[PDB]
């Protein structure tokens, strides 16, 4: 079994992540875009982060999202102890997925990343 949780506001066009082989973001004050398996969701503002490429057997085990009307910030840790971020600003409020396995990242995006809808197993 698994579950999901949504973060952020009501704007943007919905998207579905197509896998969890790599993640990058564009960010400034907010998350301008999330780039999942090379596929860009969001706008062209901000600056491009390095790409995080998951190794064999590697998955997101902890993730913190700051959000308000948009996604402000993302950070994550993997089951191999590697970290991504934080990227973004210090606005919004923080919520965390703790001791999980992320299986799919969906969301909604326009000029910014408005929302994330994270599907995961809770351990
Ligand atoms: O970057 C790509 C582009 O960048 C450019 O910048 C243009 C960018 O500009 C315009 O928006 C910027 C900015 O303008 C105003 O100041 C506000 O509208 C502002 O929005 C805030 O304030 C309004 C008014 O209160 C709220 O309704 C908003 O929800 C938002 O509110 C948060 O932030 C406020 C300021 O801090 C706080 O007071 C609020 O309390 C609230 O704060 C909460 O949330 C924060 C974020 O999570 C958090 O930090 C806080 O702690 C707190 O929790 C706005 O950002 C604008 O032109 C915009 O365009 C969009 O709207 C137009 C007109 O309707 C559309 O034509 C356009 O397609 C855009 O809409 C799409 O994108 C939206 C975002 O993804 C999406 O929601 C929407 O559905 C559409 O898909 C724009 O992108 C330019 O240089 C440009 O060239 C460019 O391409």
| Technique used by the depositors | X-ray
Resolution stated for this PDB structure, in Å: 1.0
Please choose from 65, 69, 72 the residue to mutate so as to test ligand 1's pocket, defined by most ligand atoms within 8 A of CB.
Answer: 69
C-alpha 59/C-alpha 69 separation (Å) is: 27
List, in order, residues 6 or more apart from 81 with CB less than 8 Å away.
none
* 105 exposure class (CB count in 10 Å sphere: 0-12, 13-18, 19+): buried
65: how many CB neighbours lie within 10 A of its CB? 26
Structural domains for the chain: 1-123 (2.100.10.30)
Q: In this structure, which residue's CA is closest to atom 58 in ligand 1? A: 111
Q: Which two tokens stand for residue 121?
A: 């197993």
C-alpha 68/C-alpha 70 separation (Å) is: 5
Ligand 1 atom nearest 108 alpha carbon: 75
- Residue 65 CA to ligand 1 center (angstroms) comes to 18
Cα angle value 91/92/96 (rounded, 5°): 115
Q: Which residues pair with 100 in a beta bridge?
A: 122
Length of the chain: 123
Q: In this structure, which residue's CA is closest to atom 62 in ligand 1? A: 111
- Residue 45 CA to ligand 1 center (angstroms) comes to 12
List, in order, residues 6 or more apart from 59 with CB less than 8 Å away.
20, 78, 79, 101, 102
C-alpha 62/C-alpha 59 separation (Å) is: 9
- Do residues 10 and 109 touch, judged by C-beta distance below 8 A? no
Please choose from 27, 111, 112 the residue to mutate so as to test ligand 1's pocket, defined by most ligand atoms within 8 A of CB.
Answer: 111
């Amino acid at each position: 079994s698994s579950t999901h949780r949504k973060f952020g506001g009501s704007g943007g066009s919905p998207f579905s992540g197509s896998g969890l082989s790599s993640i990058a973001v564009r960010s400034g004050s907010y998350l301008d875009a999330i780039i999942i398996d090379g596929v860009h969701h969001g706008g062209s503002g901000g600056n491009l982060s390095p790409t995080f490429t998951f190794g064999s057997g590697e998955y997101i085990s902890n993730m913190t999202i700051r959000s308000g009307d948009y996604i402000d910030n993302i950070s994550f840790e993997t089951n191999m102890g590697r970290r991504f971020g934080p990227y973004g600003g210090s606005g919004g409020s923080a919520n965390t997925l703790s001791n999980v396995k992320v299986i799919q990242i969906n969301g909604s995006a326009g000029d910014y990343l408005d929302s994330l809808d994270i599907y995961y197993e809770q351990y």
